[PDB]
């Protein structure tokens, strides 16, 4: 079941834009396979945060996460940060082994630095590479235009979803295979 | 000579990889158009160092450090982090508008931790986007091997050789 091949795609929302000062408080992933056939789905989970750290956010991130409900589900999760991240490992280990996959998704640096500062041992998961979706959008953005043009989510899944897509429609169009 | 489509190529060295122990101390730049031609070759800046930071490295950067000649020219320099960030800025803004370039290059992520955490007006000068070419290989490795089978210790060698490989992915793996 598990193959070294296979690509963990994660995305995660947060409090703020600062790996060390903010927090995650949502994470889902999508287990492909090297050609980018899904797999399986892995758990959507909110994680509990304080209500200081909910207050302590900006306007814009009070805005988004209020009217997402990803607020509400914050406050009335009873699953902390370290839970959330043995229950994504628990389905990851059932399709990756350990170092093999890279990071995949859209400027999931970020996303690798929260994981490294709130959930290293989810991070010390993937291999040291990391897939950047928007890498290959940047280029197409300034090489071939026409293949952006011919590509808005809220729902964790769907923007992982998406970002598979995304990296299809590049496969398909924009790289020489 | 400003133009939002150039893209910031930049390269540091540092002490050791954690951000919380180590610092940077060297940065170099260079400038290229959307279509990787060079525009312009930055500052290469070794970043003074008092010696309890330097003799604080663990065995592999006391090394490498000290037998490139880098380790000496961090102790010579009269340059601060704070100098660097600003001389690398003030190239920068001659070329490349605020928030347009991403940071370009390989390994940038870890760039991106230095510079966010070492020079934070320099890492809000980029695109909050990073271009890594080793997304290509990465990609090319799986999906045409022959690709990246197909494709320098300085700063600005250790650039151009990632303006090169990300111009052998465009011709050959990227069709436009």
Redesign the interface.
């Given at each position: 079941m598990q193959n070294p091949?296979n690509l963990i795609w994660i995305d995660l929302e947060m409090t703020g834009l600062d790996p060390d000062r903010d927090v995650i408080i949502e994470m889902a992933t999508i287990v492909t396979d090297?050609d980018l056939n899904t797999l399986a789905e892995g758990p959507v989970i909110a994680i509990h945060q304080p209500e200081e750290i909910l207050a302590g956010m900006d306007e814009w991130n009070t805005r988004q996460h209020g009217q997402s409900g990803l607020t509400q589900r914050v406050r009335e999760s009873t699953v902390s940060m370290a839970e959330a991240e043995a229950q994504t490992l628990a389905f990851l280990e059932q399709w990756v082994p350990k170092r093999s996959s890279?990071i995949c998704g859209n400027?999931i640096?970020?996303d690798?630095?929260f994981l490294y500062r709130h959930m290293p041992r989810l991070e010390g998961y993937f291999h040291y590479?990391?897939?950047?979706?928007?890498?290959?959008?940047?280029?197409a953005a300034?090489?071939?235009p026409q293949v952006r043009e011919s590509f808005n989510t809220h729902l964790a899944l769907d923007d992982i979803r998406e970002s598979i897509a995304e990296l299809r429609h590049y496969?398909d169009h924009?790289?020489?295979?």
């Open positions: 091949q090297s890279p400027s640096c970020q690798r630095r590479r990391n897939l950047d979706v928007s890498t290959l959008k940047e280029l300034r090489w071939a496969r924009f790289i020489k295979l």
